[PDB]
Nucleic acid binder design. Structure first.
Ligand SMILES: Nc1ccn([C@H]2C[C@H](O)[C@@H](COP(=O)(O)OP(=O)(O)OP(=O)(O)O)O2)c(=O)n1
Ligand SMILES: [Ca+2]
Ligand SMILES: [Ca+2]
Ligand SMILES: [Ca+2]
Ligand SMILES: [Ca+2]
Ligand SMILES: [Ca+2]
Length: 903
DNA sequence: CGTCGCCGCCGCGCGG
DNA sequence: CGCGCGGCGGCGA
């Protein structure tokens, strides 16, 4: 096989590399790497090295890496550019793997661990590590085993050995319900004392050194606790055995709310799963405890136990160990579904970076662009210093607040990356500038043509047309990858709806699910067989369809994130290729393109309908337009349609056969006007929305910019078995809105769009009646706990104190001087509740850490002094009033002359 | 060390 | 709670 790296580090003048050799053996080597950097040289001296502008460069080969660094400093003192890759490990990887990396994940050691630390005096601070480590479960991906290190004797209690037999048993048999599929994979090791536990763990680690190290909060907790505890017991040299090169760095993260210290283990790539989840899941969660994320992702119930975790080991050691094993497995299960490790390894090897650098698109693109340029013997420019400067972004149209019955949306494929490709925006393709006219003059095609030679954006920039820049070239490759995976995702989605349809008529038999590839549209043979399957098999197929879909979603959306981050990076001062002319060229073009096509679409439909001045486009944001289809439906008449699916086919055909060709023509003209290199403005139909035929539903509504709801029947080719609510921006989509309120507001919207005014008033009335029975967590608001100290004036709210911060301070006073109580962590999330006047807490609100039941100390008083009326008004009624007034509805029945005839 | 646009809640200081 | 500005948090793109 072709060799690939595992990890790479620079230590002084050595490169330390772990890698997989041509036989699939893990190896390590130390190389005295001789780096090269570059200087501009006279036009009249032979060289094969040129900077990106075509200026000749001389290569300077250095005796060692320190010399190279010191030369960079001298070139600064002199005032001349030091060109080339100044991150020497990236240049090493590029020299060593001068080919597309083919990696074998089965040779990479992925380690997933969690630790337990009993602590009576509150949270066990990793930097202190003053409490014994009493459990480690370490899963190894190569052995496929859960190694459990269990401490039997501790100053906090002596316990009996854990029992795998009891752990396997159902909770109803008194067992711990450890999933049977891993029971055979557990290697259990009990220990008489902590010292031997840690010594054996270190020896284990040495034999089975993690390449990728993951888990839940391992970066902020497990890793530093283990490192510091070993350090405190044995000394630094022993702690440093966690690094395969015996080098660690104790270094803080420079934030704006305080400071926390993480431990950098040279020769390991730490991918804390929480950080992977936060960057790649496209969620914002009320809580980031593993219980909460597990239940969301997997639908598994919380781990239930009695008393505080600080007493769990001594009261129930059996469960303590089992829950530690289960926590590890749960991360693996989340990964089996989301596939973030896979994504990371894919991006990492593609860019040729340290795997942990996937968190940094700037580092990712810097390496991609450097490898691409190096292939042509080109030299990257030195990074420069820039002041942070604001710049303009996308265009958003002000919608007329209203209900909208029939709506077709259109959307541009990868807008910003397509603009980069269409215009040829790259650092080395800049050709000059033209005299800009006001934007609406380009929008309305009255401005003079920018250039007869170069490719332009309405911000004034011109670009070469003879050859593609490295930014367009490289953004295209990843764009193309994205498209493949999106194709897989959409097909899995369409396949899911076929299974849903079949579930309405399940057969009564014993059978198996079909062995099919869910990434491809089902054949007719597969479709027929599905129609003959039981509910059990169809459900299992649906589960697999939905899993295939999620896999495609991870792969496609994060590739989209990466390419959109390149466009963004152009506006970040730390990007080597930072240039505001280029960032603005993208965003201004976008503003033009959206408003241009609004004008064209209107002009087209006005002509089609025989009118003048009618606004068919009701809304637009960045790259999408929303078109009123009322008149189109009306031109044939509703009475001519058999059912909903009929008008949906009607609009699907109108959008694809009439609108898209006109939209294409409009953009082709814009490309010529701007003289662009390639026409890549592809606007396809996205959504078809409307009320169920024969119903009183309103179909959709907007309340303002970025706030709207639609009843969707078809979304980019997927015909739903059941209509789907597309809701953007409204309170149902916000993590800050109480769970029960999101649910209830959603049903109100469902009722408005699908059923009408009368059904809406039925639901509201009932919800207002029963509201007070709701569980307090389901009705608590959520917020982030930022800058608590800033607004803490001796335990009481300072000036301008935010509502949620007040709640935290109320909380802090109520738990004051209790070590056992959960502390609110700066920057983490809190549940928030209003309090009725005259409550013992002495303030109007209280906040506690999210994902948790509030400490038993104050729970009773919170539930008794909870202000339901305020709660109902603030989070439910006000947003609903917002929806209904925008939609011209009433949530409460207005009095009529019909009152009353019952007498 | 990917980006900007813009929403609603809140405290504040009005607003004769 | 009528009004706007600035802090904030958070979402849409
Ligand atoms: N995080 C993001 C998301 C969006 N945008 C910009 C770039 C996008 O091109 C444009 C529209 O975003 P979309 O959500 O519509 O997605 P794309 O058009 O990029 O891709 P696609 O529509 O094919 O999924 O907005 C951005 O700058 N940063
Ligand atoms: Ca735990
Ligand atoms: Ca788009
Ligand atoms: Ca699309
Ligand atoms: Ca059937
Ligand atoms: Ca869009």
């Amino acid at each position: 096989m072709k060799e690939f790296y595992l990890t790479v580090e620079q230590i002084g003048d050595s490169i330390f590399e772990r890698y997989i050799d041509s036989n699939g053996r893990e190896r390590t080597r130390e190389v005295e790497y001789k780096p090269s950097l570059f200087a501009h040289c006279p036009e009249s001296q032979a060289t094969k090295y040129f900077d990106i502008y075509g200026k000749p460069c001389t290569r300077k080969l250095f005796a060692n890496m320190r010399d190279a660094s010191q030369w960079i400093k001298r070139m600064e003192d002199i005032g001349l550019e030091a060109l080339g890759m100044d991150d020497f490990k990236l240049a090493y990887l590029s020299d060593t793997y001068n080919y597309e990396i083919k990696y074998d994940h089965t040779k990479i050691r992925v380690a997933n661990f969690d630790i337990e630390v009993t602590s009576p005096d509150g949270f066990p601070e990793p930097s202190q590590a003053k409490h014994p480590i009493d459990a480690i479960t370490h899963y190894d991906s190569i052995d496929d085993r859960f190694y459990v290190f269990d401490l039997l004797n501790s100053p906090y209690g002596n316990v009996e050995e854990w029992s795998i037999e009891i752990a396997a048993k159902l909770q109803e048999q008194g067992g711990d319900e450890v999933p049977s599929e891993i029971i055979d994979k557990i290697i259990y090791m009990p220990f008489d004392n902590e010292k031997e536990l840690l010594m054996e763990y270190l020896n284990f680690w040495q034999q089975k050194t993690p390449v990728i190290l993951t888990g839940w909060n391992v970066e902020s907790f497990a890793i530093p606790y283990v490192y510091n505890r070993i350090k405190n017991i044995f000394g630094e040299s022993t702690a440093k055995r966690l690094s395969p090169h015996r080098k660690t760095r104790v270094k803080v993260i420079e934030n704006m709310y305080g400071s926390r210290e993480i431990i950098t283990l040279f020769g390991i790539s730490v991918l804390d799963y929480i950080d992977l989840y936060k960057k790649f899941s496209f969620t914002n969660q009320p809580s980031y405890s593993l219980d909460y994320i597990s239940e969301f992702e997997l639908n598994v119930g919380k781990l239930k136990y009695d008393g505080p975790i600080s007493k769990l080991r001594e009261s129930n050691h059996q469960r303590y160990i089992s829950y530690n094993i289960i926590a590890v497995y749960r991360v693996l299960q989340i990964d089996a579904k989301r596939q973030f490790i896979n994504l990371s390894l894919d991006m990492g090897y593609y860019a040729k970076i340290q795997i942990q650098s996937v968190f940094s698109p700037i580092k990712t693109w810097d390496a991609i662009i450097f490898n691409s340029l190096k292939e042509q013997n080109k030299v990257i420019p030195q990074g420069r210093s820039h002041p942070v400067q604001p710049y303009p972004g996308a265009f958003v149209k002000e919608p007329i607040p209203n209900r909208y019955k029939y709506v077709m949306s259109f959307d541009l494929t990868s807008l910003y990356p397509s603009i980069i490709r269409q215009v040829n925006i790259s650092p080395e393709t800049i050709a000059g500038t033209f005299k800009v006219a006001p934007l609406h003059d380009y929008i309305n095609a009255v401005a003079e043509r920018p250039s007869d030679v170069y490719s332009c954006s309405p911000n004034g920039m011109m670009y070469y047309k003879d050859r593609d820049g490295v930014v367009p070239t490289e953004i295209t490759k990843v764009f193309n990858q994205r498209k493949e995976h999106k194709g897989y995702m959409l097909a899995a989605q369409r396949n899911g709806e076929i299974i849903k349809e079949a579930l309405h008529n399940p057969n009564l038999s014993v059978d198996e699910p079909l062995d099919v590839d869910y990434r491809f549209d089902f054949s007719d043979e597969i479709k027929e067989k599905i129609k003959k399957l039981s509910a059990k098999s169809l459900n299992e197929m649906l589960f697999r369809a939905q899993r295939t879909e999620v896999a495609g979603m991870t792969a496609q959306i994060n590739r989209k994130l990466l390419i959109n981050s390149l466009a963004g990076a152009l506006g970040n001062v730390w990007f080597r290729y930072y240039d505001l002319r280029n960032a603005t060229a993208i965003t201004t073009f976008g503003q033009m393109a959206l408003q241009w096509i609004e004008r064209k679409v209107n002009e087209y439909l006005n002509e089609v309908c025989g009118t003048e001045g009618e606004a068919f486009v009701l809304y637009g944001d960045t790259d999408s337009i929303y078109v009123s289809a009322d008149k189109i439906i009306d031109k044939v008449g509703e009475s001519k349609f058999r059912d909903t699916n009929h008008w949906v086919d009607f609009l699907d055909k109108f959008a694809r056969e009439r609108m898209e060709p006109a939209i294409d023509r409009g953009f082709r003209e814009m490309c010529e006007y701007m003289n662009n290199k390639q026409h890549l403005m592809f606007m396809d139909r996205e959504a078809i929305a409307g009320p169920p035929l024969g119903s009183k539903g309103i179909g959709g509504f907007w309340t303002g910019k970025k706030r709207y709801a639609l009843n969707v029947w078809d979304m980019e080719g997927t015909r739903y078995a059941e209509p789907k609510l597309k809701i953007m921006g409204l309170e149902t989509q916000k993590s800050s809105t109480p769970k029960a309120v999101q649910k209830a507001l959603k049903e109100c919207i469902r009722r408005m769009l699908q059923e009408g005014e009368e059904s809406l008033q039925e639901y509201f009335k009932e919800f207002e009646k029963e509201f007070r029975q709701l569980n307090y967590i389901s009705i608590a608001s959520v917020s982030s706990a930022n800058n608590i100290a800033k607004y803490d004036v001796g335990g009481f709210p300072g000036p301008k104190c935010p509502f949620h911060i007040r709640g935290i301070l109320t909380y802090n006073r109520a738990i004051k001087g209790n070590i056992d109580a959960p502390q609110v962590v700066e920057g983490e999330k809190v549940y928030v509740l209003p309090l009725r006047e005259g409550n013992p807490f002495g303030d109007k609100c209280i906040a506690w850490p999210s994902g948790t039941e509030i400490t038993d100390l104050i729970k009773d008083d919170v539930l008794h002094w909870m202000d339901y009326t305020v709660l109902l008004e603030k989070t439910f009624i006000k947003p609903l009033e917002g929806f209904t007034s925008a939609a011209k509805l009433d949530y409460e029945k207005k009095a009529s002359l019909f009152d009353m005839f019952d007498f």
